[PDB]
Design an enzyme around this catalytic site. Structure first.
Site, PDB file in Angstrom:
ATOM      1  N   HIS A   1       0.671  -1.207   0.044  1.00  0.00           N
ATOM      2  CA  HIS A   1      -0.018  -0.038   0.149  1.00  0.00           C
ATOM      3  C   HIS A   1       0.913   1.049   0.173  1.00  0.00           C
ATOM      4  O   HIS A   1       0.682   2.130  -0.749  1.00  0.00           O
ATOM      5  CB  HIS A   1      -0.839   0.094   1.248  1.00  0.00           C
ATOM      6  CG  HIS A   1      -1.634   1.246   1.369  1.00  0.00           C
ATOM      7  ND1 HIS A   1      -3.020   1.302   1.116  1.00  0.00           N
ATOM      8  CD2 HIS A   1      -1.379   2.470   1.699  1.00  0.00           C
ATOM      9  CE1 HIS A   1      -3.393   2.505   1.446  1.00  0.00           C
ATOM     10  NE2 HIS A   1      -2.250   3.214   1.715  1.00  0.00           N
ATOM     11  N   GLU A   2       1.713   1.179   0.946  1.00  0.00           N
ATOM     12  CA  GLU A   2       2.644   2.432   1.245  1.00  0.00           C
ATOM     13  C   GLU A   2       3.256   2.891  -0.238  1.00  0.00           C
ATOM     14  O   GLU A   2       3.410   3.989  -0.695  1.00  0.00           O
ATOM     15  CB  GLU A   2       3.718   2.285   2.177  1.00  0.00           C
TER      16      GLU A   2
ATOM     17  N   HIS B   1      -5.607   7.104  -2.463  1.00  0.00           N
ATOM     18  CA  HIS B   1      -6.312   6.232  -2.017  1.00  0.00           C
ATOM     19  C   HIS B   1      -7.641   5.870  -2.756  1.00  0.00           C
ATOM     20  O   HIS B   1      -8.293   6.636  -3.317  1.00  0.00           O
ATOM     21  CB  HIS B   1      -6.959   6.523  -0.521  1.00  0.00           C
ATOM     22  CG  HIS B   1      -5.832   6.364   0.678  1.00  0.00           C
ATOM     23  ND1 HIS B   1      -5.883   7.304   1.858  1.00  0.00           N
ATOM     24  CD2 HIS B   1      -5.048   5.571   0.599  1.00  0.00           C
ATOM     25  CE1 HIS B   1      -4.854   6.850   2.047  1.00  0.00           C
ATOM     26  NE2 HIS B   1      -4.301   6.245   1.938  1.00  0.00           N
TER      27      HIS B   1
ATOM     28  N   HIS C   1       1.658   4.711  -3.009  1.00  0.00           N
ATOM     29  CA  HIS C   1       2.026   6.150  -2.897  1.00  0.00           C
ATOM     30  C   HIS C   1       3.142   6.583  -3.481  1.00  0.00           C
ATOM     31  O   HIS C   1       3.421   7.551  -4.308  1.00  0.00           O
ATOM     32  CB  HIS C   1       1.828   6.467  -1.453  1.00  0.00           C
ATOM     33  CG  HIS C   1       0.663   6.344  -0.794  1.00  0.00           C
ATOM     34  ND1 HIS C   1      -0.721   7.249  -1.093  1.00  0.00           N
ATOM     35  CD2 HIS C   1       0.070   5.863   0.388  1.00  0.00           C
ATOM     36  CE1 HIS C   1      -1.693   6.919  -0.228  1.00  0.00           C
ATOM     37  NE2 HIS C   1      -0.961   6.048   0.686  1.00  0.00           N
TER      38      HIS C   1
HETATM   39 ZN   LIG Z   1      -2.294   5.400   2.000  1.00  0.00          ZN
END
Ligand SMILES: [Zn+2]
Ligand SMILES: [Ca+2]
Ligand SMILES: [Ca+2]
Ligand SMILES: [Ca+2]
Ligand SMILES: [Ca+2]
Ligand SMILES: [Cl-]
Ligand code: NA
Ligand SMILES: [Zn+2]
Length: 415
Positions: free
Chosen positions: A167-168, A177, A171
């Site tokens: 997830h990180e 998101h 970015h």
């Molecule tokens: Zn996030």
């Protein structure tokens, strides 16, 4: 309170609060009221990414990363593997490649840090904010910070480093998101089986960097939509007075706090269940639900799975080896009779005698006229059998053997 902090942190709250709360509720599929109901507050307490939910691209496709330090929570080799594997998810579906570097300044610097760590976004102790990461760019652009105050794991326990790193690093690559709860880029922590890109994640990353040159063309799980008229089910069961519908990794059930339906991962309740359930029923007298996949089944009491499961179906129920899976099941409350549907046939099991009744590969067509020769899912409510087969739901009276109504599979949902 909690509300004011959450919206300040995640929804750029500088009534302006009411409008921000509506925007939050919209994001999370809550009933949009601008008022802090009990579900809204539940969501706000969920551990999540520190990056806000409201408001580019690396020029090169070959990027470097460096792990600056390592959490003592896991062996260094597991940290390296978790991060390597996370980069691999994104490189699988794009032309992006990633090289681990052991010194110097990389595009993406990864570290584990506590509280204040010198970038204007302090962590907050165990829970809450788990991690954050910075959008593509020079300096700290690309960097991913993990809250060392979390207990990081390499398995299903909270919180799986690999899952959060995937997830990180989204970015780090330019993603924001997603409102899709099935996506890795959903704000709140989720975990279900093997960490994988949802179709939403693949679509989002490819729209920035393009598709890979692999002849496969990698696919990912699509998140079911309750009001999609093409919705079909893997399995359905009554459970302690409500009906839970199952599709792939997810359950759905009606819930006053959600306008259409509550949709979440099966693993929210039962992490040890496999992916892709085939049938489910409740044995009410034992306060027990049973889930079937292949020749195996799992028993469950509320949110807890029993020991000793999986168990195979031949030894437990007395199916012949010719039965390779079951299609659907229900147990009738006041009889202890369980109906197992297998292709065009069905068996009746007596739960108290713990054996099949005599005479029992019977034909579904003979005893359930009009529903066809295959069943996806079935449950019992108010003495009626609710059969599902594709997009079709049959309300079937066992007393008269008549089809009362015939609706869409998604008809129980507020659509
Ligand atoms: Zn996030
Ligand atoms: Ca934290
Ligand atoms: Ca950097
Ligand atoms: Ca730790
Ligand atoms: Ca099924
Ligand atoms: Cl079922
Ligand atoms: Na069922
Ligand atoms: Zn930071």
């Amino acid at each position: 309170d909690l509300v004011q902090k959450y919206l300040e942190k995640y929804y750029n709250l500088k009534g302006p609060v009411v409008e921000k709360l509506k925007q939050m509720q919209e994001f999370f599929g809550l009933k949009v009221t601008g008022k802090p109901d009990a579900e809204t507050l539940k969501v706000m307490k969920q551990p999540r990414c520190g990056v806000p939910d409201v408001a580019p691209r690396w020029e090169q496709t070959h990027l470097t990363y460096r792990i600056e330090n390592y959490t003592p929570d896991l062996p260094r080799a597991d940290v390296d593997h978790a991060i390597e594997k996370a980069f691999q998810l994104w490189s699988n579906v794009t032309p992006l490649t990633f090289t681990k570097v052991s010194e110097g300044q990389a595009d993406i610097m990864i570290s584990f840090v506590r509280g204040d760590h010198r970038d204007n976004s302090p962590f907050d102790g165990p829970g809450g904010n788990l991690a954050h990461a910075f959008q593509p760019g020079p300096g700290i652009g690309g960097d991913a910070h993990f809250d060392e105050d979390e207990r990081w794991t390499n398995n299903f326990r909270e919180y799986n480093l690999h899952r959060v790193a995937a997830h990180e690093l989204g970015h780090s690559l330019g993603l924001s998101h997603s409102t899709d709860i099935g996506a890795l880029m959903y704000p709140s922590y989720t975990f279900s089986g093997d960490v994988q890109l949802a179709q939403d994640d693949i679509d989002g990353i490819q729209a920035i960097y393009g598709r890979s040159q692999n002849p496969v063309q990698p696919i990912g799980p699509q998140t079911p939509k309750a009001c999609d008229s093409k919705l079909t089910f893997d399995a359905i069961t009554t459970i302690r007075g409500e009906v839970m519908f199952f599709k792939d990794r997810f359950y759905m059930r009606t819930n006053p706090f959600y306008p259409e339906v509550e949709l979440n991962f099966i693993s929210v309740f039962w992490p040890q269940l496999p992916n892709g359930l085939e049938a489910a029923y409740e044995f009410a007298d034992r306060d027990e639900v049973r889930f079937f996949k292949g020749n195996k089944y799992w028993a469950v009491q509320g949110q807890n799975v029993l020991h000793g499961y999986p168990k195979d179906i031949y030894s437990s129920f007395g199916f012949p080896r010719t039965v390779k899976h079951i299609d659907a099941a229900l147990s009738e409350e006041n009889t202890g009779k369980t109906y197992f549907f297998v292709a065009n046939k069905y068996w009746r099991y007596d739960e108290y005698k713990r054996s099949m009744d005599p005479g029992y590969p019977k034909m579904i067509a003979h005893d359930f006229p009009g529903i066809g020769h295959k069943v996806d899912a079935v449950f019992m409510k108010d003495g009626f059998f609710y059969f599902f087969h594709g997009t079709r739901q049959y309300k079937f009276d066992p007393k008269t053997k008549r089809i009362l109504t015939l609706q869409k599979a998604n008809s129980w949902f507020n659509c």
